[PDB]
Design a protein around this ligand. Structure first.
Ligand SMILES: O=C(O)Cc1c[nH]c2cc(Cl)ccc12
Ligand SMILES: O=C(O)Cc1c[nH]c2cc(Cl)ccc12
Length: 331
């Protein structure tokens, strides 16, 4: 009979009330700078979607980050460029300084502000319980801003949180998968990294919204406070839902399926089984108790929900008791 429709419950119509140029990135006109403004210094890593380099702007001798874009539809490039341009100056959003194209190889490249190459996956065992709360809050700042701007990130994971610990600086990067949210649009589900893929993606429910970023945040939170990385470690996209179900239980999984009238892959028919919902206490142990509290546990539970609509929004998360002393200290 077809899936049941769904609307985001915050920032639902933000993009409708913008000029078309705001979200119609397909017609955006890129103005290209000169790639001879920059000399590449060293490779910073990454693959698949790009190759990232540290680079010097010869004009001001200031360090810069250059993402050579790997061949993909021109519109996906315009999309990322326009989302970046739209989010420029947002709290903890990476800042685009320029766009250039190889003189010969016509390959486009994005030039970014520099931040000290340390992302969130490393920096791990050095994080205290207050550090987790402070960096989680900083990520929520960036998530709530882009959401309020009609944009969902869709690849939230530790490799995409850059941090300068010495200055408590954090930047949400990689906007290459980000989309504008439009009420009633059916989105591609092959986004995100497996361990951070929301259930909606795994059961092919396409009318999803910002709350997908909140699931992915929940996955990060869990692996940190429990010191199990990743927390849902599935061997593929299908087994990734089974891992989730072994923890959230199958009762709620199937109520979600029913509520939105989702037709499940006949596959899953044989692998999901019956699984109670576990109490978070079962993942607590002596090496991570110092990171677990009633506050963290309450907050985590409120992010990891099958039903994308019962997950906390960014702004609700930011008001959770979990963040009280970071909210206090920051003022
Ligand atoms: O070494 C290269 O690939 C050529 C090249 C020199 N400087 C650049 C700056 C950008 Cl942004 C992109 C490509 C280049
Ligand atoms: O923006 C992106 O998607 C590319 C990227 C990968 N690693 C980085 C580190 C910094 Cl500091 C700035 C930007 C990047």
């Amino acid at each position: 009979s077809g899936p049941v429709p769904s609307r985001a419950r915050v920032y639902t119509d933000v993009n409708t009330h913008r000029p078309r140029e705001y979200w119609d990135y397909e017609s955006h006109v890129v103005e290209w700078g000169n790639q001879d403004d920059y000399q590449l210094v060293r490779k910073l890593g990454r693959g698949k979607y790009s190759e990232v380099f540290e680079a010097i702007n010869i004009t001001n001798n200031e360090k810069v980050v250059v993402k050579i874009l790997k061949p993909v539809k021109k519109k996906k490039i315009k999309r990322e460029i326009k989302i970046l341009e739209n989010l420029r100056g947002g709290p903890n959003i990476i800042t685009l300084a320029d766009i250039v194209k190889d003189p010969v190889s016509r390959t486009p490249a994005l030039v970014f502000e520099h931040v000290n190459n340390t992302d969130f996956k490393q920096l791990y065992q050095t994080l205290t319980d207050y550090d987790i709360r402070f960096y989680m809050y900083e990520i929520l700042k960036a998530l709530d801003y882009c959401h309020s701007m009609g944009i969902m990130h869709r690849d939230v994971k530790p490799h995409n949180v850059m941090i300068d610990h010495e200055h408590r600086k954090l930047r949400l990067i990689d906007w290459g998968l980000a989309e504008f949210y439009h009420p009633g649009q059916e989105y591609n589900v092959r986004v995100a990294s497996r361990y951070f893929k929301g259930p909606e993606l795994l059961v092919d429910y396409q009318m999803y919204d910002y709350s997908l970023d909140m699931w992915s945040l929940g996955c990060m939170l869990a692996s940190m406070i429990f010191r199990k990385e990743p927390f849902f470690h599935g061997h593929d996209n299908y087994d990734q839902l089974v891992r989730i179900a072994k923890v959230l239980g199958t009762e709620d999984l199937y109520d979600y399926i029913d509520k939105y009238n989702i037709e499940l892959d006949p596959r899953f028919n044989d692998i999901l089984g019956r699984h109670s919902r576990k109490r978070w206490e079962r993942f607590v142990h002596s090496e991570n108790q110092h990171l677990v509290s009633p506050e963290a546990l309450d907050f985590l539970d409120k992010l990891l929900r099958y039903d994308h609509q019962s997950r906390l929004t960014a702004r609700e998360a930011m008001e959770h008791p979990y963040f009280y002393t970071v909210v206090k200290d920051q003022a």
